Design a binder for these strands. Structure first.
Length: 49
DNA sequence: ATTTTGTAGCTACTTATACAAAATTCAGGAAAATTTTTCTGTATAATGGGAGCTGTCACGGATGCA
C-alpha cells in the first residue's frame, strides 16, 4: 500500500480540476497513457479516472 | 402462709406546654477596594486592491437583432 501510494499520481488538486467541474472524457484512457499509467487502476467512487 | 393478688392508695415523679429569650448563626449590603475595562492621542509625510478563473445547463430568454 505504500508504494502504490507513493507512486500514485493525481489529477485533482489545486491547479487541477474538481470532480464536478470535470466530467468524463477527461477520465479516459487516452491512448497515450499506454505505458504510462496503469489503466487498471483506480479507485472508484467518483474518482474513477 | 407467702405470695401474689389488691385496692385503694398516696406520693414522688416525670413527662408535656408553651414561651422564650436568648443564642446563634446567616445573608445581604454595603463598601470599599481594586482590578479591569474603556477612552484618546499621536504631528516630517504618506493619497486606488486582489485575483485568475478560465471544461455541464438551460432556459428561458433572448432582448436584441440584423
Amino acid at each position: 500500500a505504500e508504494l502504490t501510494h507513493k507512486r500514485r499520481l493525481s489529477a485533482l488538486g489545486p491547479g487541477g480540476l474538481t470532480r464536478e467541474r470535470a466530467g468524463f472524457a477527461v477520465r479516459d484512457i487516452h491512448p497515450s497513457h499506454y505505458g504510462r499509467i496503469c489503466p487498471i487502476e483506480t479507485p472508484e467512487g467518483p474518482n474513477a479516472g
